[PDB]
Amino acid sequence: HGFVQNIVIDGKNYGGYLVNQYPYMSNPPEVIAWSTTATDLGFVDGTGYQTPDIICHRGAKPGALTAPVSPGGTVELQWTPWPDSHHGPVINYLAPCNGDCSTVDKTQLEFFKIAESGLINDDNPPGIWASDNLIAANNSWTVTIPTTIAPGNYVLRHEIIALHSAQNQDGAQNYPQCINLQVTGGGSDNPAGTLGTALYHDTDPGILINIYQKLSSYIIPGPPLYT
Ligand SMILES: *[C@@H]1O[C@H](CO)[C@@H](O)[C@H](O)[C@H]1NC(C)=O
Numbered sequence: 001h002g003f004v005q006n007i008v009i010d011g012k013n014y015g016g017y018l019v020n021q022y023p024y025m026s027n028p029p030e031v032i033a034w035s036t037t038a039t040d041l042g043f044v045d046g047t048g049y050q051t052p053d054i055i056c057h058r059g060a061k062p063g064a065l066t067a068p069v070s071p072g073g074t075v076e077l078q079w080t081p082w083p084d085s086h087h088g089p090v091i092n093y094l095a096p097c098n099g100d101c102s103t104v105d106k107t108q109l110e111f112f113k114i115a116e117s118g119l120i121n122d123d124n125p126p127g128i129w130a131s132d133n134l135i136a137a138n139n140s141w142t143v144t145i146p147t148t149i150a151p152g153n154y155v156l157r158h159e160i161i162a163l164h165s166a167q168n169q170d171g172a173q174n175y176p177q178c179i180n181l182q183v184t185g186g187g188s189d190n191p192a193g194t195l196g197t198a199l200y201h202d203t204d205p206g207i208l209i210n211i212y213q214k215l216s217s218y219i220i221p222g223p224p225l226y227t
């Protein structure tokens, strides 16, 4: 359980969607982060993979604001303290807004995977995962925006999948957090995109899995990494 509290881009903080404050406020502030109804700080499990909730989390609506990023620039997402127990991958996708991200229909967004990190080491099952990397970096993740993509407005869908309960059907816990970016530079790729509702299925090999046993491999869920 947790959420993204802050985003660091080009030397300033863009405050996150503080899901334990703003839902209680009813004139809440404008941010680059999508609003959600996930006030339990919880997840979308396999029962929700083909619902709109998977796209940018439960009840999500676009952020009003969009943050410019320098070409090949970093976006650092700062989480609330991630529990060691919640082992699993950290996955990052972009979808083009083809206009202002604040007015997009999230159900039409087509995501391409720009980064994925999975099982890092399995010397002591359940092992060391991308989520443990995030903990070791004091609960932050650095995303580098590719220089080879067509610049424009994009949703960054940033996600931890916790697998501590994933040996049961619909046990995997997805924690998607969306923010609005203005990608800048000279690139031209328009990578093939996947609907939010086709990212994951509740029987995928990296989703329905027992992490407590020795693992010979881990198949990071979602569509193929764009390079
Ligand atoms: C996180 O930062 C705090 C100090 O602000 C420190 O006490 C903790 O050990 C840090 N680093 C790691 C690897 O957790």
Ligand SMILES: [Cu+2]
Binding pocket: 001, 002, 086
């Ligand atoms: Cu949790």
